[PDB]
A paper describes a structure:
Rhodopsins are seven-transmembrane proteins that contain retinal as a light-absorbing chromophore and a light-induced trans–cis isomerization of retinal triggers their activities. There are, however, 9 genomes from a high salinity environment, 8 were from the same site and showed little genetic variation. All of the CyRs included Lys204N2098R in the seventh helix (helix G), which is known to make a Schiff base linkage between the rhodopsin protein moiety and the retinal chromophore in other rhodopsins. Heterologous rhodopsin gene expression analysis showed that the rhodopsins in the CyR clade function as light-driven outward H+ pumps.
The crystal structures of cell-free-synthesized N2098R and N4075R were determined at 2.65 Å and 1.9 Å resolution, respectively. The long C-terminal helix is bent at the end of helix G, Gly215N2098R, and covers the cytoplasmic surface of helix C–F. A pentagonal cluster consisting of three water molecules adjacent to the Schiff base of Lys204, Asp74, and Asp200 plays an important role in proton transport (broken lines). The overall structure of N2098R is similar to that of GR (RMSD 1.91 Å) and ASR (RMSD 1.40 Å), but the structural position of the water molecules and amino acids around the retinal and the putative exit region of the proton are quite different. To examine the amino acid residues crucial for the proton-transport activity of N2098R, mutants at the putative proton acceptor Asp74N2098R, proton donor Glu85N2098R, or counterion Asp200N2098R were examined. Replacement of these amino acids prevented light-mediated change of the pH of the cell suspensions despite expressed as well as wild type in E. coli cells, indicating that these residues are essential for proton transport; this finding provides further evidence that N2098R functions as a light-driven outward proton pump. A structural comparison revealed a high conformational similarity between N2098R and BR, and a mutant analysis confirmed that the putative proton donor and acceptor in N2098R both worked as expected.
Numbering used by the authors:
A (entry chain A): -1 to 238
B (entry chain B): -2 to 224
C (entry chain C): -1 to 240
The structure:
Amino acid sequence: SGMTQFWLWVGFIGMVIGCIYFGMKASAMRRREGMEFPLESFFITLWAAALYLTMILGETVTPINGQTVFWGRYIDWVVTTPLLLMELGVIAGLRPKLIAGVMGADIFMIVTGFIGAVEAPPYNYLWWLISTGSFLAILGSLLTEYSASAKRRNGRINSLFQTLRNILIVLWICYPIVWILGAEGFHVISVGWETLCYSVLDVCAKVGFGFVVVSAGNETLAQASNSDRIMETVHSYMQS
Amino acid sequence: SSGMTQFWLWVGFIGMVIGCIYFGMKASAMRRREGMEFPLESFFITLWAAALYLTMILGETVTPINGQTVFWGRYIDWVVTTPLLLMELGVIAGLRPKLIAGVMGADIFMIVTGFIGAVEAPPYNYLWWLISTGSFLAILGSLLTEYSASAKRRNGRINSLFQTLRNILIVLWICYPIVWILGAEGFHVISVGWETLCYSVLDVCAKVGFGFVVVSAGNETLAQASN
Amino acid sequence: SGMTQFWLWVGFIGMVIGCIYFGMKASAMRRREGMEFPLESFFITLWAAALYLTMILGETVTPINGQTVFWGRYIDWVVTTPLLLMELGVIAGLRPKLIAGVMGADIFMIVTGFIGAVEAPPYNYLWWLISTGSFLAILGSLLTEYSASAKRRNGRINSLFQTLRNILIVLWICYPIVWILGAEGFHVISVGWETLCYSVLDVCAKVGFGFVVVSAGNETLAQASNSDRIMETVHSYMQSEE
Ligand SMILES: *C/C=C(C)/C=C/C=C(C)/C=C/C1=C(C)CCCC1(C)C
Ligand SMILES: *C/C=C(C)/C=C/C=C(C)/C=C/C1=C(C)CCCC1(C)C
Ligand SMILES: *C/C=C(C)/C=C/C=C(C)/C=C/C1=C(C)CCCC1(C)C
Ligand SMILES: CCCCCCCCCCCCCC
Ligand SMILES: CCCCCCCCCCCCCC
Ligand SMILES: CCCCCCCCCCCCCC
Ligand SMILES: CCCCCCCCCCCCCC
Ligand SMILES: CCCCCCCCCC
Ligand SMILES: CCCCCCCCCC
Ligand SMILES: CCCCCCCC
Ligand SMILES: CCCCCCCC
Ligand SMILES: CCCCCCCC
Ligand SMILES: CCCCCCCC
Ligand SMILES: CCCCCC
Ligand SMILES: CCCCCC
Ligand SMILES: CCCCCC
């Protein structure tokens, strides 16, 4: 009731703070290399801040079949989570075609998760399993193609990737658990407590995640986005 | 959905599920190799088609809109799979990337305008069918001109692979307006159950059958197609 | 209204005429380079023509909370307006990553404007201010990185960009003013005159804007789309932070 709107505000204020920070740093290096990382970090927080305002105002919260569905989360995630995987893919030096495949799996994961959030007690679990299935394929890529590519970059880029990869995996693994423990699955935790965990995860997965990216230095991010080094990484990754 | 409709929604589902395992196995086996995009594109095409077919089995994307029951999950399926099919065919033909995007934009326009007719009145569903068919002819033109005029300029065994897939695509895609205009969206001359039979047979042919011929071309061939 | 239906037809006819013109010039520039410009201009007018037809038939005009919302405009704008900024981005020689940022902010502008169009009198203004904020940042980029990159390019191309930029700026400024003075905000102007303004703005911003693009020489258009002349304006722009 009141706990839901309070923690919806905590998420919205957390997103806005990241917007000011990422937006300032992104426009401070508009002519530089590595600009795409604070730029992507800014749009991820911007899209999340808007959608969090849609839920605060109740614009994207709707009862479908007896359950109050916060469907604005899926409008958020279907855009922000592919951008996060793309941002991590550029740092890892992964081939863009494999990045597009991982982003495609992410869209499938979010869309099927939305179907489960709108489904009945029998079928909300079925779509949860299918979405989790694509989630494991994403986790497999983050530990295989992502890690094998980044290992072939300089030590500081591979160091930044592994930190961001571990941050991503630890945070994202909690999302389906919050989903299944909330109103979409087993109504064992309250909606307010579910709103609490989602906002804490969202701020960590977007603002805290983006902070680690921009805190790597202008030289690091410029090297991670450099075309010569990326094509060098993709080539070396393919010869094994 | 009725008994025949539900039966043929399952045939399309199983067809896409089978294609997923084949294309998915081949895709992750060519991960560090060239030509990987073709088994991967074929996998995502069958994967997105499989999920949408499941939504229609469960009636999640089956709804009455203006009296009629509209299977709007098909247009969620088509607006994604058909642009990917033309893009995969555009890379095999060695087409310029800017005109691949243009052909894909014309394809999205075709699916969207076709969806408007699916939910419209018998006066205006035929009007949008003609608009949708108009862009379909422009795509058939590009398939017979720019697609063929760029595959000629490439390796002789790639050009043969293109002409096979393209002629498969053209003959298959031509029946879709026929079923639509003869189905519930146009003149209801065939039943919804019989209409779903045609869509299931066509979808499995144009996705798993089409995708099979692509991956059945050899690894050194698909590597040359992606360079 | 009778006036809205009339001016919905004017916009629809204006978009169709633009389709015939740009489609003819596109199919006459097949294996030439610079083909993307009349083809981009053609798709912009085609998407707008189809969406204007959906509004004529009332398919995309619906009472949402009881206010008549022409939500087909936002289905149109969320597609055509990012293409216009992208097409202008290629002419200006702007780096593609910054083009994507402007395009993303443009989609943000249309989406938040659609939310305001369907919301109550308290919060329709709040989303109007949010959308106008991203509009100001886009105008900032048009005067900043767009102009700084086209300045270092050919004299014929920089002249074309500035003409298109001034045309875009002047036309796009009127949209939030029509919006806030129309049914979406304070209902100061009627639905009929609001339909007039949107039709007049849309035709000029798509048919007239694209006309200036295609009415440039095939020399200028081929040079504006060149891969390595776009790599050189990017290399010079990215290294001249002086
Ligand atoms: C910033 C928001 C983020 C990073 C959201 C991430 C969300 C997920 C990783 C959601 C995953 C889901 C599953 C794995 C299956 C069931 C439903 C979802 C959507 C909770
Ligand atoms: C795998 C699914 C495929 C390949 C579907 C293809 C569908 C079409 C080519 C549909 C075309 C239509 C028209 C040309 C006009 C009227 C309506 C449609 C959607 C049947
Ligand atoms: C061809 C159609 C065009 C160029 C439409 C342009 C529309 C805009 C620049 C709209 C801007 C808006 C704001 C700046 C804030 C409030 C709402 C909008 C959508 C009117
Ligand atoms: C490139 C590797 C990640 C993309 C592949 C997408 C696979 C999605 C897995 C679907 C699993 C379905 C569970 C039944
Ligand atoms: C009435 C619902 C029952 C559906 C049964 C479907 C059986 C599928 C037959 C085998 C399909 C094989 C496709 C290649
Ligand atoms: C496929 C290459 C681009 C061709 C342009 C596609 C647009 C066709 C629209 C036709 C509409 C016809 C209405 C009667
Ligand atoms: C490279 C293009 C710049 C993109 C920045 C987008 C800015 C959005 C501003 C939103 C402000 C919200 C109003 C308070
Ligand atoms: C019975 C629940 C209805 C499910 C709607 C599914 C929407 C899928 C959007 C692609
Ligand atoms: C009253 C209008 C009938 C509904 C038509 C819906 C068309 C949607 C086009 C996207
Ligand atoms: C630069 C701060 C942007 C804040 C966005 C507010 C929610 C759309
Ligand atoms: C080895 C680094 C792990 C980082 C995970 C932190 C998530 C809060
Ligand atoms: C009704 C109180 C729910 C408490 C849930 C706590 C989950 C960590
Ligand atoms: C760069 C040429 C692309 C024109 C078509 C735009 C995609 C809808
Ligand atoms: C590869 C498994 C397909 C599942 C369809 C929902
Ligand atoms: C190049 C990344 C910017 C994308 C914004 C949607
Ligand atoms: C009801 C307004 C929400 C729109 C989300 C795109």
